[PDB]
Amino acid sequence: MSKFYKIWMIFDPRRVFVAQGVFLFLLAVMIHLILLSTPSYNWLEISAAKYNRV
Amino acid sequence: MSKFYKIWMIFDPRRVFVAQGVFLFLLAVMIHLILLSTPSYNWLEISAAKYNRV
Amino acid sequence: MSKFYKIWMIFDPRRVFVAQGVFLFLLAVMIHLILLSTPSYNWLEISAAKYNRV
Amino acid sequence: MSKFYKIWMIFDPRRVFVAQGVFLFLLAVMIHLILLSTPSYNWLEISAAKYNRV
Amino acid sequence: MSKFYKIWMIFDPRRVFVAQGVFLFLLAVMIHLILLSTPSYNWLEISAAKYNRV
Amino acid sequence: MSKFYKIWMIFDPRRVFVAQGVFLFLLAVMIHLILLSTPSYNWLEI
Amino acid sequence: ALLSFERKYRVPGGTLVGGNLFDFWVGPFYVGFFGVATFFFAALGIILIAWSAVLQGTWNPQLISVYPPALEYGLGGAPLAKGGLWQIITICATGAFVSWALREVEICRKLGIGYHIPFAFAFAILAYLTLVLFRPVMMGAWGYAFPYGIWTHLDWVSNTGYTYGNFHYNPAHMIAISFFFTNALALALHGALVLSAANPEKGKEMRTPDHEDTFFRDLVGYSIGTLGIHRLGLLLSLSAVFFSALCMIITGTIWFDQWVDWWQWWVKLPWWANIPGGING
Amino acid sequence: EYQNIFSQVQVRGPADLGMTEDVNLANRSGVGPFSTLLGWFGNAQLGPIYLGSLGVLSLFSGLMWFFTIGIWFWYQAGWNPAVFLRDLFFFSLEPPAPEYGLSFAAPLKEGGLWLIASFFMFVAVWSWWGRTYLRAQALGMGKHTAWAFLSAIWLWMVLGFIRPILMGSWSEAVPYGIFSHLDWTNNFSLVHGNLFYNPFHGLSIAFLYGSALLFAMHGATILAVSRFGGERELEQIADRGTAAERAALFWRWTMGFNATMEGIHRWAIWMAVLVTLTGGIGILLSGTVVDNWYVWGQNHGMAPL
Amino acid sequence: MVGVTAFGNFDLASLAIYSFWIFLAGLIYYLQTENMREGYPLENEDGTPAANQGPFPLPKPKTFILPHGRGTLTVPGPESEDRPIALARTAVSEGFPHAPTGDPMKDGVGPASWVARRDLPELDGHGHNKIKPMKAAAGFHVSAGKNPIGLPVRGCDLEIAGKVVDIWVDIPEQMARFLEVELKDGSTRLLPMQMVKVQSNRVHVNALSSDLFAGIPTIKSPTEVTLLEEDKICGYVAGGLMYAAPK
Amino acid sequence: KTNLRLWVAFQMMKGAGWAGGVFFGTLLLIGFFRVVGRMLPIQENQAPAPNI
Amino acid sequence: LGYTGLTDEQAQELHSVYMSGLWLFSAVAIVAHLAVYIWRPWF
Amino acid sequence: SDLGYTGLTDEQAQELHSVYMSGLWLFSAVAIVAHLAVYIWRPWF
Amino acid sequence: DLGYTGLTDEQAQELHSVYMSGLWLFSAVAIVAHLAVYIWRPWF
Amino acid sequence: DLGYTGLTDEQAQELHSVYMSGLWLFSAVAIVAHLAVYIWRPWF
Ligand SMILES: CCCCCCCCCCCCCCCCCC(=O)OC[C@H](COP(=O)([O-])OCC(O)COP(=O)([O-])OC[C@@H](COC(=O)CCCCCCCCCCCCCCCCC)OC(=O)CCCCCCCCCCCCCCCCC)OC(=O)CCCCCCCCCCCCCCCCC
Ligand code: BCL
Ligand SMILES: COC(C)(C)C/C=C/C(C)=C/C=C/C(C)=C/C=C/C(C)=C/C=C/C=C(C)/C=C/C=C(\C)CC/C=C(\C)CCC=C(C)C
Ligand SMILES: COC(C)(C)C/C=C/C(C)=C/C=C/C(C)=C/C=C/C(C)=C/C=C/C=C(C)/C=C/C=C(\C)CC/C=C(\C)CCC=C(C)C
Ligand SMILES: COC(C)(C)C/C=C/C(C)=C/C=C/C(C)=C/C=C/C(C)=C/C=C/C=C(C)/C=C/C=C(\C)CC/C=C(\C)CCC=C(C)C
Ligand SMILES: [Fe+2]
């Protein structure tokens, strides 16, 4: 549990950091687009309906 | 979190700066295009309605 | 901010200058085309309507 | 601004001159074509309408 | 104005003359075809209509 | 036209003559085709 | 400007037309007589595409289309706004392609290499001329050629194909498709093999051509070799293009009906034509 | 005048058994016969071939798939050899009817035999992929062939497995026949609007044409510099010679930029894997995301409104 | 998901196409930088580093480990010609040809150029020489073609220049690579197999006139040929196409 | 020089003759295709216009 | 970490001239936007 | 120091820039006159 | 002093003089042609 | 003198004289042809 630092002697930090960055960005973009295509969580349209911007 | 500077002992600053510039520009363009595609928050059409330009 | 000049120690000035010129020209052309696509900011058609030229 | 001449220490004059000539010609052609696409600035059709030539 | 003759310190006249001939012929052909495309200034059709050749 | 003859100290005259013959022939063919496509001036049609 | 080894190769000779005239480089490009011709024709064709876009009334590069003359003009000239711009652009394209091939010939003989590349390019030029010149001439109208638009020439492909029903019942068409698929497969295999030999597992020496031969003999029991694979690549590509040109040249000229109906000569062969079973019986 | 298309003299020597890096030599066969006909164009030697566990698995599964389709064809002919030869190219194993969904309850005649054949094919293809990977590994080479094959497998899996599952029906899959899968291709285009207006379809076609273009260019270049021993590219990578420089300078003087003796193969592998990758994506999007590609093109600036 | 858009007309297909455009730009950048491992930095016509170098930066070095203990190769790396070039400028401006100072075929410039490759023979997977004379090869014989041994060799001037003595064979590929030609003075030269046309009664060399055969570079060992010697021979024979056009 | 006049004329004519030979050869090829299509039954069976 | 071969003084001078050019470009752009906003505001 | 990548000295760069600016101002003056003529003939604002 | 093409100062001056003579001749012909076209059929 | 082509001044003068004679002959023939066509069928 406290020996999780041992992972850095098996993976080199460069590849892990690049892979993690790409993964995190793509996951966040996908989640945002999923929320944006759902009418109940499209915050732009919610704001449009709340303030009568139509 | 103080010693975040040691990232530059792992990542070449030349590659990171180019990648970051490309990423930031593409993200800004994407968000602006999202806003232009929304009938609200399209500042050009908002002003056209506000000043009776149609 | 007082040390932003060291980017020229990181990046070669002439490659940056060429890339910057291309980027600025393409950005300006993009914005002008976006304005010409908008009926309420196409200055040619605005002048056609103003002076009644058909 | 008084030291803008050092760009010729950065850039080779003849490559810049060739690129500049190509850029200027293409820009001029682009603008002329854009004007000819507009009904209210196509000077050939403006003269056709003015002198009643069909 | 008076020092423009130094352009021949930058460019060998042979390649310049080849490029200038190509450019001027291309431009002239462009303009002639542009005029021929329009119903006005198509001198062949203008003459046909003027002399009722049909 | 005072010193135009110095063009022959820039370009080799044999090559220029051959290339000029090619250019003139192609230009003549281009103009003749443009004339043929028009309903008038089509001397073959008439 | 120059590559580290380029200087010893730039020597005065190998031209077909002209001499020291036009025997120079502009940056990396070599510009002979046919370099000048190619540049003129290409620039004129591109500016004429732009002017056709102006006449059409669209600036969307995916909506720009230059249509050939209508069928009622036959093989004669047409007005510029209606069919003539397409004809001038076709002439410019043919000139640009031929001048490009001849420029490649000049470069080849300046470098002392064989003329395999201009020959291979001439194959593609001939396929283009089959679609745009030979088939329209045999069918008797410029209106059977395709338009110059990114998505409208796909409309030409679809209409031409569906005139004869499902078009991949054309037999030469089947041969051409098989050649294209085999070519893509062989290109993938060849690139992968050379890269796998030059980039072995980490920390190992480069592999030899013996290792490549061994790999393919282990996999499929045969290795064609290096000379063999390059010969095979050239021949597969050229055969694909040749059979595509053939299948289009026979389509509106010798054949006139559904190709699926062509495949019925085999079924109606006398010594099994009436046996009652299966699909066609 | 000699264009190096066909060899003019042919020589033979002792057969080359191959390298022994850490390949299990007990799983190799003997060398086959030399063929003069093949030797005119490439190598004459046939074999040896490596057969291992995955070779056995792939051969058994592929033979069973082939035999299942063949026995179904023989059944459709009524066991008549004349009808079998006449209506070959017209027989077809069809997937289950649309009303069965993804279920496995379809009868043998109405799509169950198609499921059996498909299972055999699945096993055969994946074991062959594993075989390519392991044959590369035994010789100490990189796994580029396995990844290119993985691209091809991606398109195959989308056509036969992934897309039918997302659509919720085995009837979406491709039948096993010569003319029937051509009919399937045409009907797939007709049902989904016009497949020409699928952008990934266009990209796939661009990369197929590009494979033909790049392969013709590269074969011609290597044959043109083969007078300097340019075909021996693995050595031209390690020790650059006049062949590589002449090829690079030809393409540089022609189109303004060139490749190396290794970068050109990088271009090659990517040009092919891209046709198959973009094709897989374009087929996956059809019917699950876009039902009418022409209308999609109209809404996306590709077709006139 | 048919008709589900996050904004505007942007659905999973639009997301896919834009993601692919980004991926394709990145892939093209990678492919060009990988192609930039030979011939860079760009040089002036006088040998100095050019002012301009291009839109793509030079890639990080990678090392090849050559087999049979031949060493390593790190590219990109310092690249030098390591041979004199007998060419003179025809113009002060750049972009014009360089004219040969002496005999181009002897000097090895133009289409007659060669590269300073390693002075060792090419090896096979087992360490033996890749290319051997068919006499020294064990069990090799001509199988199905016209056997060139004993045929006269005719140059581009339609004159006899020698006779074929042996065939040099690529042992792993099992293909003929060179023809060994004995001249009138009892000396032998190597001719690339790709540059000769073997006819019924003769071998015809279109690239090289009969007198120029004596000028072909020789091999210092009768039993093997190195990479450098192969460069010289192939470059000479190919340069004959341009530099033996008269006669 | 009269020889100079004839030499310039000969160079012009060489260029013009090569251009004319190429142009007329293309026309002869077009005529070949036109004739072989005239001998074919295209008139009886004409395809509809592919361009719309 | 020179990375380009420039010294400290060279980098300072190049950045000074670059910033002069950037401020000139920005001033022209600001005047253009002021003119457009007076002519036809977008807020 | 020089920082030059192009081989020009300081005086050479100054002279080249002077001539280039003369040409640029001539081109700009011609363009300004052309725009004035077009705007008088047919204003776009 | 600056040299890229091998021309001296006098050579450049003479070449530019002849080039400008040719340019002015071409421009004069073009001006006459435009005057004729504008009289025949003005475009303004 | 630049002398990229190896011609002297007198050689260039003589070559240009003959070239101009040929050019004027060609132009005269073209002028007569245009006069004939314009009389037969004017285009203005
Ligand atoms: C999201 C969009 C934007 C994304 C990013 C945008 C940012 C900018 C662009 C960045 C991208 C630049 C790409 C350039 C990379 C250069 C690669 C290279 O050639 O060599 C370098 C490097 C090694 O070079 P080397 O010097 O030769 O090494 C030799 C070694 O010494 C010894 O050899 P080795 O053992 O190491 O193997 C060598 C091999 C090593 O290559 C690999 O390892 C590839 C691994 C397989 C691909 C991963 C997907 C497989 C399916 C997932 C299941 C397994 C995951 C992988 C498991 C990893 C285990 C290691 O390297 C190669 O050269 C291979 C050349 C050809 C590879 C072809 C790959 C075909 C993939 C088939 C896909 C099937 C499913 C697709 C599903 C749909 C996807 C859209 O190879 C790689 O890094 C391969 C890159 C793999 C990319 C996969 C394709 C991605 C598709 C996305 C398309 C865009 C999205 C469109 C739809 C979106 C919908 C929303
Ligand atoms: C009316 C018909 C439709 C149409 C419908 C389709 C459909 C439907 C599809 C295509 C697909 C493709 N089409 Mg389309 N197509 C049309 C018109 C065209 C035109 C044209 C000029 O008009 C062209 C050039 C193309 C070209 C293409 C290809 C780029 C693409 C296939 C890639 C490939 O290699 O697949 C061939 C390769 C494979 C299928 C991979 C196979 C891999 C497996 C692993 C192999 C296993 C072998 C097996 C075990 C057998 C063993 C044999 C023994 C070992 C010997 N089409 C029109 C619009 N086309 C595909 C695509 O990707 O679309 C996006 C597709 O699915
Ligand atoms: C869609 O958007 C639309 C098109 C509507 C509008 C968009 C508009 C924007 C994007 C266009 C932007 C254009 C750019 C910014 C314009 C820049 C123009 C400048 C750069 C042109 C400058 C030209 C200078 C030339 C004319 C100078 C020439 C000098 C003489 C010809 C030669 C002098 C050189 C001397 C001789 C060098 C030798 C001296 C030494 C001592 C030897
Ligand atoms: C869809 O979204 C829309 C388009 C609607 C909106 C999106 C907007 C966003 C995404 C656009 C973002 C744009 C970026 C962020 C703008 C940045 C602009 C800056 C970077 C431009 C700076 C330009 C500086 C130039 C003008 C400087 C020039 C300096 C002189 C020309 C030369 C000076 C160099 C000297 C001479 C170097 C030599 C000195 C040494 C000593 C030799
Ligand atoms: C779509 O847009 C449209 C087409 C409607 C309109 C757009 C128009 C714009 C984009 C067109 C721009 C056109 C350009 C900028 C026009 C420039 C024209 C100038 C550059 C022409 C100059 C011609 C000069 C030539 C005629 C000089 C000829 C001199 C020879 C007759 C003799 C020279 C021989 C000397 C030099 C020998 C010297 C050697 C001794 C040893 C001294
Ligand atoms: Fe290869």
Author numbering:
A (entry chain I), B (entry chain F), C (entry chain D), D (entry chain A), E (entry chain 9): 1 to 54
F (entry chain 7): 1 to 46
G (entry chain L): 1 to 281
H (entry chain M): 2 to 306
I (entry chain H): 1 to 247
J (entry chain X): 16 to 67
K (entry chain E): 7 to 49
L (entry chain B): 5 to 49
Copy text verbatim from the article accompanying this structure deposition.
Genetic deletion of the pufY gene had no notable effect on the oligomerization states of the RC–LH1 complexes, suggesting that PufY, which is not involved in monomer–monomer interactions, is not essential for dimerization of RC–LH1. The cryo-EM structure of the ΔpufY RC–LH1 monomer (2.86-Å resolution) shows that the RC is encircled by an LH1 ring of 13 subunits, forming an incomplete RC–LH1 complex with an enlarged LH1 opening of 51 Å adjacent to the QB site. Compared to the WT, the ΔpufY strain shows a comparable growth rate but a slightly early onset of the stationary phase under both moderate light (ML, 25 μmol photons s−1 m−2) and low light (LL, 5 μmol photons s−1 m−2).
The reaction center (RC) and light-harvesting complex 1 (LH1) form a RC–LH1 core supercomplex that is vital for the primary reactions of photosynthesis in purple phototrophic bacteria. The RC–LH1 supercomplex comprises an RC surrounded by the LH1 ring that is made of multiple αβ-heterodimers. LH1 collects photons directly from sunlight or from the peripheral antenna, light-harvesting complex 2 (LH2), and transfers excitation energy to the RC. In contrast, some Rhodobacter species, such as Rba. sphaeroides, possess dimeric RC–LH1 core structures, representing the largest photosynthetic complex in anoxygenic phototrophs.
